[PDB]
Design a protein around this motif. Sequence first.
Motif, PDB file in Angstrom:
ATOM      1  N   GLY A   1      14.095  -6.660   2.739  1.00 52.59           N
ATOM      2  CA  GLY A   1      12.919  -6.310   2.514  1.00 52.59           C
ATOM      3  C   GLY A   1      12.497  -6.515   4.042  1.00 52.59           C
ATOM      4  O   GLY A   1      11.234  -7.057   4.422  1.00 52.59           O
ATOM      5  N   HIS A   2      13.013  -6.028   5.012  1.00 58.45           N
ATOM      6  CA  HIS A   2      12.298  -5.571   6.194  1.00 58.45           C
ATOM      7  C   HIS A   2      12.993  -4.855   6.303  1.00 58.45           C
ATOM      8  O   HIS A   2      14.344  -3.524   6.158  1.00 58.45           O
ATOM      9  N   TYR A   3      12.277  -4.044   7.145  1.00 55.04           N
ATOM     10  CA  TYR A   3      12.276  -2.365   7.711  1.00 55.04           C
ATOM     11  C   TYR A   3      11.249  -1.934   9.297  1.00 55.04           C
ATOM     12  O   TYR A   3      10.763  -3.164   9.542  1.00 55.04           O
ATOM     13  N   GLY A   4      11.759  -1.184   9.639  1.00 57.24           N
ATOM     14  CA  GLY A   4      11.646  -1.164  10.605  1.00 57.24           C
ATOM     15  C   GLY A   4      10.462  -1.279  11.486  1.00 57.24           C
ATOM     16  O   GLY A   4       9.110  -1.745  11.243  1.00 57.24           O
TER      17      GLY A   4
ATOM     18  N   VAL B   1      10.303   2.842   2.593  1.00 52.85           N
ATOM     19  CA  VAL B   1      10.337   3.092   1.177  1.00 52.85           C
ATOM     20  C   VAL B   1      10.971   3.674  -0.476  1.00 52.85           C
ATOM     21  O   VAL B   1      10.862   3.164  -1.362  1.00 52.85           O
ATOM     22  N   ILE B   2      10.871   4.777   0.511  1.00 54.39           N
ATOM     23  CA  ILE B   2      11.162   6.207  -0.688  1.00 54.39           C
ATOM     24  C   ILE B   2      12.855   6.168  -1.017  1.00 54.39           C
ATOM     25  O   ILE B   2      14.070   5.780   0.328  1.00 54.39           O
ATOM     26  N   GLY B   3      13.330   6.055  -2.139  1.00 49.74           N
ATOM     27  CA  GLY B   3      14.090   5.871  -2.461  1.00 49.74           C
ATOM     28  C   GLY B   3      15.521   7.005  -2.510  1.00 49.74           C
ATOM     29  O   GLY B   3      14.984   7.909  -3.070  1.00 49.74           O
ATOM     30  N   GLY B   4      16.578   7.213  -2.073  1.00 51.57           N
ATOM     31  CA  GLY B   4      16.973   8.440  -2.147  1.00 51.57           C
ATOM     32  C   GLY B   4      17.311   9.765  -1.449  1.00 51.57           C
ATOM     33  O   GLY B   4      16.383   9.396  -0.870  1.00 51.57           O
ATOM     34  N   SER B   5      17.965  10.267  -2.275  1.00 53.65           N
ATOM     35  CA  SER B   5      17.379  11.747  -2.127  1.00 53.65           C
ATOM     36  C   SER B   5      16.322  12.827  -2.403  1.00 53.65           C
ATOM     37  O   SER B   5      16.240  12.921  -2.835  1.00 53.65           O
TER      38      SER B   5
ATOM     39  N   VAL C   1       9.343  11.913   4.071  1.00 50.67           N
ATOM     40  CA  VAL C   1      11.126  11.782   3.727  1.00 50.67           C
ATOM     41  C   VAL C   1      11.657  10.511   3.314  1.00 50.67           C
ATOM     42  O   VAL C   1      11.155  10.176   4.034  1.00 50.67           O
ATOM     43  N   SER C   2      12.700  10.785   3.061  1.00 49.78           N
ATOM     44  CA  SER C   2      13.635   9.158   2.934  1.00 49.78           C
ATOM     45  C   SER C   2      14.629   9.362   4.425  1.00 49.78           C
ATOM     46  O   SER C   2      14.781  10.001   4.016  1.00 49.78           O
TER      47      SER C   2
ATOM     48  N   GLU D   1       0.718  -0.656   0.206  1.00 51.45           N
ATOM     49  CA  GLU D   1      -0.110  -0.028   0.368  1.00 51.45           C
ATOM     50  C   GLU D   1       0.520   0.648  -0.233  1.00 51.45           C
ATOM     51  O   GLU D   1       0.353   2.305  -0.960  1.00 51.45           O
ATOM     52  N   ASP D   2       2.224   1.508   0.892  1.00 57.15           N
ATOM     53  CA  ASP D   2       2.772   2.878   1.064  1.00 57.15           C
ATOM     54  C   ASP D   2       3.210   2.688  -0.514  1.00 57.15           C
ATOM     55  O   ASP D   2       3.249   3.994  -0.809  1.00 57.15           O
ATOM     56  N   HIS D   3       3.718   1.105  -1.015  1.00 53.39           N
ATOM     57  CA  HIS D   3       5.060   1.864  -2.005  1.00 53.39           C
ATOM     58  C   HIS D   3       4.009   2.276  -3.392  1.00 53.39           C
ATOM     59  O   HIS D   3       4.391   2.725  -4.476  1.00 53.39           O
TER      60      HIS D   3
END
Lengths: 278, 278, 278, 278, 278, 139
Positions: free
Chosen positions: F36-39, E220-224, E184-185, E124-126
């Motif tokens: 594939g593990h998040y906090g 889920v959010i990549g990089g800057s 933010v990432s 969902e988040d992605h």
Amino acid sequence: MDFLDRNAAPLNEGEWQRIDEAVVSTARRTLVARRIIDVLGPLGSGVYSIPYSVFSGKSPTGIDMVGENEEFVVEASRRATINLPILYKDFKIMWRDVEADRHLGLPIDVSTAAVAGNFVAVQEDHLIFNGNVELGHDGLFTVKDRQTVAISDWNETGAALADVVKAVGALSQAGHYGPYAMVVSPVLFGRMIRVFGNTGMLELDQVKALITGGVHYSNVIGGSKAVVVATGSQNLNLALGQDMVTAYMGPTSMNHVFRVLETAALLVRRPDAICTIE
Amino acid sequence: MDFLDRNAAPLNEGEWQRIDEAVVSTARRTLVARRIIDVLGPLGSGVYSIPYSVFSGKSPTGIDMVGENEEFVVEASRRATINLPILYKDFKIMWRDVEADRHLGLPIDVSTAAVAGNFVAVQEDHLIFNGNVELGHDGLFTVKDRQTVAISDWNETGAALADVVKAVGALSQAGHYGPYAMVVSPVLFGRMIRVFGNTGMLELDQVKALITGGVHYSNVIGGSKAVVVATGSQNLNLALGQDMVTAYMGPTSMNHVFRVLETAALLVRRPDAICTIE
Amino acid sequence: MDFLDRNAAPLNEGEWQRIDEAVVSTARRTLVARRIIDVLGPLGSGVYSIPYSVFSGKSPTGIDMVGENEEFVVEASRRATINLPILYKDFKIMWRDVEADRHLGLPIDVSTAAVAGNFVAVQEDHLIFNGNVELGHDGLFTVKDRQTVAISDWNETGAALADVVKAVGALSQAGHYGPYAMVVSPVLFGRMIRVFGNTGMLELDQVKALITGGVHYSNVIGGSKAVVVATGSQNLNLALGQDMVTAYMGPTSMNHVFRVLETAALLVRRPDAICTIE
Amino acid sequence: MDFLDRNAAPLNEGEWQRIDEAVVSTARRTLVARRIIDVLGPLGSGVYSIPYSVFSGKSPTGIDMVGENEEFVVEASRRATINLPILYKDFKIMWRDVEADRHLGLPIDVSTAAVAGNFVAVQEDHLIFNGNVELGHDGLFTVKDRQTVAISDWNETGAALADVVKAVGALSQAGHYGPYAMVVSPVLFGRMIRVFGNTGMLELDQVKALITGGVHYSNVIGGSKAVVVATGSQNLNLALGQDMVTAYMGPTSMNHVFRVLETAALLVRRPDAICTIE
Amino acid sequence: MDFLDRNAAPLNEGEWQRIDEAVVSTARRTLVARRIIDVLGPLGSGVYSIPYSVFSGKSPTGIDMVGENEEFVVEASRRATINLPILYKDFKIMWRDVEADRHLGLPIDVSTAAVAGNFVAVQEDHLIFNGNVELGHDGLFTVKDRQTVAISDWNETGAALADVVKAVGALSQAGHYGPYAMVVSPVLFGRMIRVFGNTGMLELDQVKALITGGVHYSNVIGGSKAVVVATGSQNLNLALGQDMVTAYMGPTSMNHVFRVLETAALLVRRPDAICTIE
Amino acid sequence: LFTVKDRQTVAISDWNETGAALADVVKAVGALSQAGHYGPYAMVVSPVLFGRMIRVFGNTGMLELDQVKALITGGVHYSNVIGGSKAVVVATGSQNLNLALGQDMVTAYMGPTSMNHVFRVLETAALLVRRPDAICTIE
């Protein structure tokens, strides 16, 4: 419901029933599509979009004493989705004619309604056969996965029967057995009848032997084209939404104004069942 | 009964009645066999096999003032027996569409059922006309005691009528008087219509004068072949078992899965009544 | 319990009764192991693994006027736990056979259920004697400290008695007095049906006179092997979780699928109580 | 039922009771197969054919901790149908003997009925053991996947026991344990009546001690032949449609004709359960 | 409803209550988007698609003494449809653990349910932030008419506050005032944890003082990357068809399979309400 | 956690440098994200290393331990039993790890020996490494 706010119009139940008849009976005569494309629904006034499967793939059928397989499914190649547009045209009924009816009993001339019904049904055919670019629809002469046949010179007496046999060949290759139907542009319909030759028979009846669902002209199909359709709810439907109806829109000036609206869309569930000759 | 466990499906009685209609009406259009082969039964869901007589021998008829003979029987040349296979094909109905129907009232698109009905009926025709090797069945183009005629070159205007007259000759020699019916492959049907010549008439109607039960194409019959059948329950029947019906098989994934099943078999009681042209 | 279901299944009570009887009666016919080895349990379906004690070592024993010492304790040479696998086989009862029963009257062919029962009993037999490699179980032919007795050629009359005497010597030298039992690969068991010397009874009868727990055979025991077991619920136990039962699993395709299952493991409490002739 | 009925026949109830008993008590002395094979049913007078399952092949069993896998399903090597013949003979009671009985007490001659009962029982026995070629019914001596043993002379002492040991050495190693049964031809059954060594019981009584389910002989079986059968409905049944009964076929001249008839066939569900010594 | 139901499933109410809570309480810790965006509905299990309006353009407003003019109508820049995907994973509860629970109290292992709840919440988040290309769903980072800011290093002090000031300097000047929200990432969220000058609170607490509607981060959010959103249903909603729920998909072997599923899509009614710092 | 063979691992840096410990935590959380593990992650550190995180992280003007505590929302911990320079990063929750108690810690009376009363503290506990890849060890 009451978007169809027929309570606010002056027209009495008889005048409505005669408008509805003058619309319906004009639709029945005018439409070619509903002769070869079966109606789906009507679904209801509120449905904005339809999800529908595309069954564009051929697959085997199960045959066994007992039923020990599960590979013999039918599976949608894709679940497409289509929005149902509105087709509409408007007609005035002058307030004097309503007054003449309600006092003198000289009845409303509903032919304005019948002319609107015609101008809507013509557009319905145009949408179904030619598609519509700006709604992003597709029609029998635009749907991309369809079969196609290169048309020969139908000024020769051998041409049209051979091209029909090509088209039914290509439909049989898809596994669409009959009954086939065909719709032809007038430019070609006035050739199937016109090249009887010394063999002295109309090619239209020769083809009507094979295309047992019958042949029709339609001026809507511009230029030299034809389409052969394996008929039925298995292959196509015309999804109506709300069937051809007249709505009141209140007055403009003293006159009354009415709208014919129709919300239909073409569900080409099986493009492999369509074979254009063009 | 309840092998047809329609209690466990979610579909309400209306959705079932519309599935049954969408199956039946697709069968009626798709089948060629049930136009020339009469249905026997339906016998019941449980019947696994049929004993049936072969009446392949000609014999005299009694004619007397009083009835003083007993030699004028009909006696089975053999009591054969045939197992009734299952023909089946499966279609999913996605659970979302059932939820849309039950809440919104956007109705189930039963065209998945109609497509399964088509893919079963196509197989039913294939079984009836071509037989089936691995079930050990026989069909009109395989049954061994049938009449046969060597086909001429049907690209000549004299050919097809002469070969039909040969076939009806050979049926009359068996003592099968009419009414005859004939089924023709498209490769030949597109020749009976195509070699009208300067004599300017379709051979299809010329033959339809003699073969009063009518002529049909069927793509199921591969290559150049035809079969002439002396119609009736006296000669053939299509034994159904359980007539074309849709069964629920529980869910797979969240989706529902349904099966069209049909248990029919061809009782060629009198091979001498069949005459293939090939 | 109720991990199984009786009620969603199509079967009536009399059909369940016939299936269960055909299972139990094929087990009794096939469970050779439960003749030579006592059942511990059946403890219940919930039991997943069992702790057990192995007494491979031997220890001093107390002889004193007062009993002062406390070194003389029974020490389990290892204390271990074993996991109870599932032993299972699925048999499929066709919908047509239920339909014939419910309408025509032909009883269900439960022979599939009996064959599943046999394949489960044979899998339990193979587990007990040979042990499943992947689960890391030990079988009577694969436990580590068993009395290995070299086999001689039982084509010589009296050799099978000679090797039985060897095996019962080796067991008796280890505190395991009778009653012994022996299970023999049937190629040797046939070779034990000889008249023994001048003696006036069979070598099988001499062996039974010495092996008062009886002689049995089973297909699983590898060619020309046998095992002698110093029977009793001390020296060995078979631990049963759920004892062999039938459970419905819903349909697959449209046919009813049923499962036979049992959970069983061999508790080799005394690896010295076993002698293999090999 | 009523395909046979007794109201039309002339006899009083006592004459039926004697004719029936004179049939049954002559059958009983002659039915051998029903001793070695379970009767199935009798299923019903109208049962014309039976579907049955042949488990010639073998497949792995599930042994795993959770039972995830699905492959471990019992599949018949083939599914087959058998057609139940009628076994019958017609025996005529001359009307004068009945008319004498009513007036002078001289009993109806039942000996014809006993002869018919004998001929039917003999034909049943022959059909089961030797089969019938026209009906395509394999018998216990002729089924394909049976086990076979090359017979010795049986003119040594112990050769009959040795060949019986070979036969149990080939039903075992093939999934079948006892109780076995056996039928031998009389030429060999005499050759089994020897005192076996120093043992003080016949070699027949050794073979009976090994084959606890019974040793019989029938003159129907030609030459040096024996068949060993792993008894039980899991492997074989005699399927009975109509158990042996007397039917009145109406008169002929004024004499009375009665029919003894029986409908019966051999179901061989597990071919490997059969071993022939030959 | 009833597309999911619990009467067929084996569990008692407490085992459902724990499995549900073990799903929901694992989702809650992971749902970030639902913090920054209003949930719409949930509209209903059967809502397959939604029409929505995108107000990308701007138009004049009526300012006049009488309000004569008619032109000043709000027109959507486009009217659009979105199709709600299903977000799901299938987690299997092995039947032995349930059967143990009923008899030995050892709890059902819920950890699979928590893992499924996590995987659904992550998807969902992605879907919301990054979008999905196959479904053609734009996300908050990928919608076309969003505002954008060329990010600085954020490795000076105050560069994160300066870029946040640029972002509010580009939601303002575009019709949107606060309360803004931001995600933010984590690579940058750490770089926002600096003490801001002589101020004695973190630069994160300055950014929170400017962005009062909340600052979050998701792995889920990549990089800057950062996205700044003008909150409120006037601009964005998360449209929910089915809020996250557990569904019993029936058995498999004898194990139980359950499905966690959710149906959810991002409605972007005002694209200019979104600014990405990137 | 330090022995399970399918676990993630990171090569330990010299935490006598500034920022090296945070950089290693960044590596570990990277590898858990890739797995594939998040906090919420948690962490445990040997005191020989843990003390080396009580530094001013740099120009940032705050403790590096507070940086890690902001990145690892389950908090840093330390223990005697993590011998030498090692740390473990864990994606917390029953979805990944559980500690199963048979009998939670309790005292039992064992009776007199000599005449002095003997008591026993006991506990039954075992580690359910339901997902080894949810562990990453910095070592």
